[PDB]
Amino acid sequence: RIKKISIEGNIAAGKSTFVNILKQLSEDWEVVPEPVARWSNLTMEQKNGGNVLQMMYEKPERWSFTFQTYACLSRIRAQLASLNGKLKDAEKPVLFFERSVYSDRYIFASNLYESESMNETEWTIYQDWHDWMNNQLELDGIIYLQATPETCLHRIYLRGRNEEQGIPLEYLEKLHYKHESWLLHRTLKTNFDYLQEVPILTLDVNEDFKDKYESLVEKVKEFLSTL
Amino acid sequence: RIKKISIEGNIAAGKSTFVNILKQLSEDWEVVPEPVARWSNLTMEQKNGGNVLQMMYEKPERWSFTFQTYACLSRIRAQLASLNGKLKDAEKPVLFFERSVYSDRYIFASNLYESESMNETEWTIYQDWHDWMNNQFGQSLELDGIIYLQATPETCLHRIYLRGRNEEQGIPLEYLEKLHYKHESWLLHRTLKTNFDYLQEVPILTLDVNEDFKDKYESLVEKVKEFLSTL
Numbered sequence: 030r031i032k033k034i035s036i037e038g039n040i041a042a043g044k045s046t047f048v049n050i051l052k053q054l055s056e057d058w059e060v061v062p063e064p065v066a067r068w069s070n071l072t073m074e075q076k077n078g079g080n081v082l083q084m085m086y087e088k089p090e091r092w093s094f095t096f097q098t099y100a101c102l103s104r105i106r107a108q109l110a111s112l113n114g115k116l117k118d119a120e121k122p123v124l125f126f127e128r129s130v131y132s133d134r135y136i137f138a139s140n141l142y143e144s145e146s147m148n149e150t151e152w153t154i155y156q157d158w159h160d161w162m163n164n165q166l167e168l169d170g171i172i173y174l175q176a177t178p179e180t181c182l183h184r185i186y187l188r189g190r191n192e193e194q195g196i197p198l199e200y201l202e203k204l205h206y207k208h209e210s211w212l213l214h215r216t217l218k219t220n221f222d223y224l225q226e227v228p229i230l231t232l233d234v235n236e237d238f239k240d241k242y243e244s245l246v247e248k249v250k251e252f253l254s255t256l
Numbered sequence: 257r258i259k260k261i262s263i264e265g266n267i268a269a270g271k272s273t274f275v276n277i278l279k280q281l282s283e284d285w286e287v288v289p290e291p292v293a294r295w296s297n298l299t300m301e302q303k304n305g306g307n308v309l310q311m312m313y314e315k316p317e318r319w320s321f322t323f324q325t326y327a328c329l330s331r332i333r334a335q336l337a338s339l340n341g342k343l344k345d346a347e348k349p350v351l352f353f354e355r356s357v358y359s360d361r362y363i364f365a366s367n368l369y370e371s372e373s374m375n376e377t378e379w380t381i382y383q384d385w386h387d388w389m390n391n392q393f394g395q396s397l398e399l400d401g402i403i404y405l406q407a408t409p410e411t412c413l414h415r416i417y418l419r420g421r422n423e424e425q426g427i428p429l430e431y432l433e434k435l436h437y438k439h440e441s442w443l444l445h446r447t448l449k450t451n452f453d454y455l456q457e458v459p460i461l462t463l464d465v466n467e468d469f470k471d472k473y474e475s476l477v478e479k480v481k482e483f484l485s486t487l
């Protein structure tokens with residue numbers, strides 16, 4: 030009954046700006062934020078999330094498996110809980126996930142394996158881990174907030190985490206092409222077949238929508254009407 | 257309907273041997289060997305296990321978190337596969353688990369932590385994941401019982417050489433004494449304060465297996481059978 034839509038995009042591309050605006054326009058809409066975004070700050074998960082992230086910055090090749098695995102759990106935990114304990118007696122139910130378990134694996138984990146930050150056994154253990162848990166949160170559509178690396182880079186400054194001032198354009202750039210293929214070009218191979226058929230919607234967020242978000246919202250309601 | 261009984265011991269207790277002995281004595285009686293033993297011998301799980309098992313040996317403070325999470329994840333899946341594809345239509349089906357999710361954590365992973373092969377953050381993550389893989393997926397796995405095969409750490413080392421796996425040949429001693437200690441701390445004194453409420457209610461057949469039992473096991477099985485009727 031509840032619709033499940035993933036908001037997807039690059040770092041600082043506006044996913045969080047979009048979801049904060051969407052939550053407020055309808056009684057019947059709620060968002061599940063990125064737990065990785067909360068770790069950039071505190072309870073068990075917050076400290077654990079705190080440390081693993083920082084360790085990742087110093088030495089990705091040592092910490093990527095651990096962080097990719099714990100990120101995904103934290104997200105799966107956090108989404109499941111919204112289903113089974115929210116949008117409780119609203120009429121036209123929609124949940125907006127900030128990124129997904131397909132992001133975790135097929136953008137993020139993948140990229141780390143391609144940067145040799147995960148060795149083969151870690152990558153293959155992570156996929157088996159990910160494959161088995163899944164078929165036991167499944168999406169009704171995906172919204173792609175599409176931005177260039179340059180836009181994202183500035184935005185990283187705008188909010189001003191220091192580790193991202195660090196984050197370089199070449200890192201943005203490869204995260205950027207991994208989105209086009211799954212989502213825009215539609216040709217990244219994946220182990221979850223229905224996501225070749227999952228309805229997708231793409232929005233340009235280069236322009237500052239902070240004070241001009243009706244054109245985007247209109248396309249979102251439009252999008253939801255066909256599902 | 258299928259009762260689940262964990263065989264817990266230290267390394268080279270004779271578990272594999274004994275579960276294998278029990279398994280031939282009844283058609284109501286099936287076994288789930290431990291994923292790790294299998295790796296210590298193929299599938300994508302073996303291929304992964306042999307690799308991470310081999311690295312675990314080679315640099316344990318890099319690979320302990322990885323190893324533990326995969327070994328436990330893999331146990332759950334075997335115990336599920338068995339507890340779906342075995343023993344329907346048995347009048348009194350019994351499933352004997354070669355080790356359990358609880359030895360994965362409170363004995364091996366805990367030990368790896370305490371021996372500094374995992375930092376706090378890894379051990380806190382593991383523990384979080386553990387509660388959660390078990391809650392979400394591992395509900396059908398609560399144990400009706402545990403059979404503790406208790407041998408002395410020395411009996412155990414004596415036993416390690418005979419099995420004679422190349423990789424295992426260099427396993428130290430003081431390890432065993434720490435494991436036994438946790439195995440005794442866990443399965444005799446019950447000082448170990450599990451987070452799993454129901455482990456305090458599950459009874460424990462403690463069996464002394466310091467005497468060789470491979471051709472002379474009838475009293476061992478008799479004890480199981482009376483324990484089994486008490487469940």
Ligand SMILES: CCCc1sc(-c2ccc(OC)c(OCCF)c2)nc1[C@@H](C)Sc1nc(N)cc(N)n1
Binds near residue numbers: 066087089
């Ligand atoms: C955003 C802050 C968390 C970090 S830190 C990080 C990173 C840090 C330092 C790095 O090199 C020294 C690095 O690249 C190593 C090889 F590229 C990645 N990537 C990331 C994410 C892009 S990985 C990630 N995985 C997820 N599953 C989810 C998510 N939101 N982010």
Ligand SMILES: CCCc1sc(-c2ccc(OC)c(OCCF)c2)nc1[C@@H](C)Sc1nc(N)cc(N)n1
Binds near residue numbers: 290312361365368
């Ligand atoms: C015997 C093959 C599996 C291995 S390899 C291993 C190990 C080997 C060498 C080590 O130091 C060089 C080592 O570090 C011990 C530090 F306390 C562990 N421990 C073990 C187990 C005791 S860890 C384990 N955890 C499980 N959950 C299951 C299982 N069968 N084994």
Ligand SMILES: O=c1ccn([C@@H]2O[C@H](COP(=O)(O)OP(=O)(O)O)[C@@H](O)[C@H]2O)c(=O)[nH]1
Binds near residue numbers: 038039040041185237
């Ligand atoms: O239309 C926008 C979208 C974002 N931002 C700013 O860009 C930064 C990063 O955006 P966000 O936190 O949404 O990034 P994401 O959630 O995509 O990582 C934040 O400081 C926002 O306030 C902005 O000024 N205008």
Ligand SMILES: O=c1ccn([C@@H]2O[C@H](COP(=O)(O)OP(=O)(O)O)[C@@H](O)[C@H]2O)c(=O)[nH]1
Binds near residue numbers: 467
């Ligand atoms: O009563 C016994 C118990 C064990 N063993 C031998 O000791 C080693 C330990 O066996 P096992 O692999 O069954 O122990 P586990 O590690 O599975 O607890 C094996 O070579 C067995 O053949 C034996 O000869 N008599």
